[PDB]
């Protein structure tokens, strides 16, 4: 099969489009209760204009809101990226709210993968309380891939989703290594084991030195949720966003 080649092309063409106004806005809107592909680039733009008008103009909006021009192309934080890309992959005609879906708390990653169906595609959304980090694990029909973004500030360095995708988005990651990360046990692992796993799974250069386990919240809660997806449908949804 040629799923991986197509997946790479699909993710590529999608990422390239994101420097385009309408594509960026539809991709990284944070309303999760309607179909992502139903997001209208002019509706969103009107909403921003309105919001700015309400704050007495752009100058004043920026002054009160931190300095951000809300018209600018967005570099998504990890939650916004994970949520939206999850939406894009799983949605057909029924809105999926990734913030409202049920998450698993008392089952390990190995437990769950073993129960998933073999000829089906799944994407897993991970909320890692130890890293303070959301990211996706893609499981096409075993082999896994990481989709993520990161503004930094925690154990891991900043990484734009575009860069991550381009350099590591098709980099198969070990299920085995993945289980060791996604485990209550991970918190009490030696500094170098932790560092090594983080770099290996989540750092763009596989580099221990860019990781800082002193920023881990060791009493963190690990939660994740998986969802089946139609691969062709994922391509559909991606093509739509890229085509704006």
Swiss-Prot record:
The active site is at residues 78, 133, 148. It is an enzyme of class 3 (hydrolase). One of its GO terms (biological process) is symbiont-mediated perturbation of host cell cycle progression. It is found in: Secreted; Host nucleus. GO terms for molecular function: protein-glutamine glutaminase activity; toxin activity. Keywords: Host nucleus, Hydrolase, Secreted, Toxin, Virulence. It catalyses: L-glutaminyl-[protein] + H2O = L-glutamyl-[protein] + NH4(+). The keyword Nucleotidyltransferase does not apply. Transmembrane segments: none annotated. Its EC number is 3.5.1.44. One of its GO terms (cellular component) is extracellular region. Belongs to the Cif family. Protein-glutamine deamidase effector that inhibits the host cell cycle and other key cellular processes such as the actin network and programmed-cell death. Acts by mediating the side chain deamidation of 'Gln-40' of host NEDD8, converting it to glutamate, thereby abolishing the activity of cullin-RING-based E3 ubiquitin-protein ligase complexes (CRL complexes). Inactivation of CRL complexes prevents ubiquitination and subsequent degradation of the cyclin-dependent kinase inhibitors CDKN1A/p21 and CDKN1B/p27, leading to G1 and G2 cell cycle arrests in host cells. This is Protein-glutamine deamidase Cif.
